[PDB]
Design an enzyme around this catalytic site. Structure first.
Site, PDB file in Angstrom:
ATOM      1  CG  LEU A  39      -1.120  -1.310   1.821  1.00 43.31           C
ATOM      2  CD1 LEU A  39      -1.557  -1.228   3.364  1.00 43.31           C
ATOM      3  CD2 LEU A  39      -2.068  -2.119   0.897  1.00 43.31           C
ATOM      4  N   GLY A  40       1.874   1.218  -0.874  1.00 37.64           N
ATOM      5  CA  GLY A  40       2.440   2.480  -1.293  1.00 37.64           C
ATOM      6  C   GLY A  40       3.791   2.746  -0.695  1.00 37.64           C
ATOM      7  N   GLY A  42       7.346   5.207  -0.163  1.00 37.89           N
ATOM      8  CA  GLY A  42       7.510   6.543   0.353  1.00 37.89           C
ATOM      9  C   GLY A  42       8.952   6.953   0.509  1.00 37.89           C
ATOM     10  CB  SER A  45       8.203   4.763   4.915  1.00 36.67           C
ATOM     11  OG  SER A  45       7.102   3.907   5.151  1.00 36.67           O
ATOM     12  CD  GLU A  46      10.073   0.272  -0.408  1.00 38.29           C
ATOM     13  OE1 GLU A  46       9.785  -0.939  -0.391  1.00 38.29           O
ATOM     14  OE2 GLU A  46      10.956   0.732  -1.154  1.00 38.29           O
ATOM     15  CG  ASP A 150       3.377  14.553   7.526  1.00 35.72           C
ATOM     16  OD1 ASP A 150       3.045  15.492   6.767  1.00 35.72           O
ATOM     17  OD2 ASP A 150       3.824  13.421   7.134  1.00 35.72           O
TER      18      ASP A 150
HETATM   19  N1  LIG Z   1      -0.975   6.821   4.950  1.00 34.50           N
HETATM   20  C1  LIG Z   1      -0.665   5.696   5.451  1.00 34.50           C
HETATM   21  C2  LIG Z   1      -0.457   4.247   6.020  1.00 34.50           C
HETATM   22  C3  LIG Z   1      -0.524   3.176   5.116  1.00 34.50           C
HETATM   23  C4  LIG Z   1      -0.648   3.456   3.662  1.00 34.50           C
HETATM   24  C5  LIG Z   1       0.371   4.223   3.009  1.00 34.50           C
HETATM   25  N2  LIG Z   1      -0.054   4.224   1.784  1.00 34.50           N
HETATM   26  C6  LIG Z   1      -1.215   3.596   1.430  1.00 34.50           C
HETATM   27  C7  LIG Z   1      -1.900   3.449   0.216  1.00 34.50           C
HETATM   28  C8  LIG Z   1      -3.121   2.711   0.247  1.00 34.50           C
HETATM   29  C9  LIG Z   1      -3.641   2.087   1.409  1.00 34.50           C
HETATM   30  C10 LIG Z   1      -2.921   2.258   2.635  1.00 34.50           C
HETATM   31  C11 LIG Z   1      -1.713   3.036   2.657  1.00 34.50           C
HETATM   32  C12 LIG Z   1      -0.364   3.675   7.449  1.00 34.50           C
HETATM   33  N3  LIG Z   1       0.422   3.816   8.587  1.00 34.50           N
HETATM   34  N4  LIG Z   1      -0.108   2.864   9.519  1.00 34.50           N
HETATM   35  C13 LIG Z   1      -1.179   2.185   8.952  1.00 34.50           C
HETATM   36  N5  LIG Z   1      -2.061   1.100   9.448  1.00 34.50           N
HETATM   37  C14 LIG Z   1      -1.324   2.686   7.708  1.00 34.50           C
HETATM   38  C15 LIG Z   1      -2.368   2.279   6.678  1.00 34.50           C
HETATM   39  N6  LIG Z   1      -3.090   2.008   5.767  1.00 34.50           N
END
Ligand SMILES: N#C/C(=C\c1c[nH]c2ccccc12)c1n[nH]c(N)c1C#N
Length: 325
Positions: A39-40, A42, A45-46, A150
């Site tokens: 889910l993406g 960063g 981070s990933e 943030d």
């Molecule tokens: N923004 C954020 C976080 C996760 C994700 C980051 N890109 C995404 C793209 C699509 C779906 C979820 C996320 C995050 N941090 N802790 C969690 N449970 C999270 C969730 N979901």
């Protein structure tokens, strides 16, 4: 220069509480958790979906980039301090990859609905309800000595059907201590307080309250982001076209803030706009006099004059959410 609430709260606690460099995480095994779906990715981070095989609890897995031990301890320690706090994302474990030795954090999963499809459908009550719930989150972490730094729509996860809210991504969060000078390279461009854009390092929790203003305006006017800057210079210009440029020079004066000479050529002179200038038939159903009063008191240049989280929760804009508790 000093926060108007909870200014001293970390100095009245054990040094252990806020001395993150000295925190020792226990690093578990990142193999009990099985990736499913990225889910993406960063910055450092990933983020992935997965299952705690030890019983089968769904989870989210954030894989740090361990060329900065200190940032890692800061975030772990802050989540330890906010465990079980109102609307904060529950951190479950801290783990590492055996063969790879790289660390990672494991977070309660959330069936959020994406703000880009959920803001389309919010009613005037939804907006008040979720904002109240985001406020509870922010008053908690602030009173635990902590700035999120943030706040923005991607970090406010909302399960509309369960009517649950979780604020997330604490990799930029930081302990507030009075007079301490902070990095301004925090927060998304669109949600950066003017203090960051003018490089004033002595900021505090009130920064999150600006970020929250920005979210509020985007929600009741349906312009997302509300202040849509091209860079940090243009972002401050966008703000000044709304708040007025004279009310900006007054701030800088009050706090003795040196203004980069590149702003002269681009700020111009603008008057303070009326927050009614943004209403039109597509968003009229979301905008009320009590909504613009809250807004005017969140988006101020003077970070000190900004409504705190608790003052904001008391606002008449929220009386509909209070009674329905
Ligand atoms: N923004 C954020 C976080 C996760 C994700 C980051 N890109 C995404 C793209 C699509 C779906 C979820 C996320 C995050 N941090 N802790 C969690 N449970 C999270 C969730 N979901």
């Amino acid at each position: 220069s000093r926060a108007r609430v909870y200014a001293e709260v970390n100095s009245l606690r054990s040094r252990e509480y806020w001395d993150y460099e000295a925190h020792v995480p226990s690093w578990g095994n990142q193999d009990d958790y099985q990736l499913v779906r990225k889910l993406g990715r960063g910055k450092y981070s990933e983020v992935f979906e997965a299952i705690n095989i030890t019983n089968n609890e769904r989870v989210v897995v954030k894989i740090l980039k361990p060329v900065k031990k200190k940032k890692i301890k800061r975030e772990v320690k802050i989540l330890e301090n906010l465990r079980g706090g109102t609307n904060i994302i529950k951190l479950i474990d801290t783990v590492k990859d055996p063969v790879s030795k790289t660390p990672a954090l494991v977070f309660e999963y959330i069936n959020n609905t994406d703000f880009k499809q959920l803001y389309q459908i919010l009613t005037d009550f939804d907006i008040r309800f979720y904002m109240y719930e985001l406020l509870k989150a922010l008053d908690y972490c602030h009173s635990k000595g902590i700035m999120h730094r943030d706040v923005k729509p991607h970090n406010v996860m909302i399960d509309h059907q369960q009517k649950k809210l979780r604020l997330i991504d604490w990799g930029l969060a930081e302990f507030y201590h009075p007079a301490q000078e902070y990095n301004v390279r925090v927060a998304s461009r669109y949600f950066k307080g003017p203090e960051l854009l003018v490089d004033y390092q002595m900021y505090d929790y009130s920064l999150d309250m600006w970020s929250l203003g920005c979210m509020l305006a985007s929600m009741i006017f349906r312009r997302e982001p509300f202040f849509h800057g091209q860079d940090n210079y243009d972002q401050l210009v966008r703000i000044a076209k709304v708040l007025g440029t004279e009310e900006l020079y007054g701030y800088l004066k009050k706090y003795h803030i040196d203004l980069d000479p590149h702003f002269n050529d681009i700020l111009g002179q603008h008057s303070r706009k009326r927050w009614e200038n943004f209403i039109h038939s597509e968003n009229r159903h979301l905008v009320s006099p009590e909504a613009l009063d809250l807004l005017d008191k969140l988006l101020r240049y003077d970070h000190q004059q900004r409504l705190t989280a608790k003052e904001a929760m008391e606002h008449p804009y929220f009386y509909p959410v209070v009674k329905e508790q």
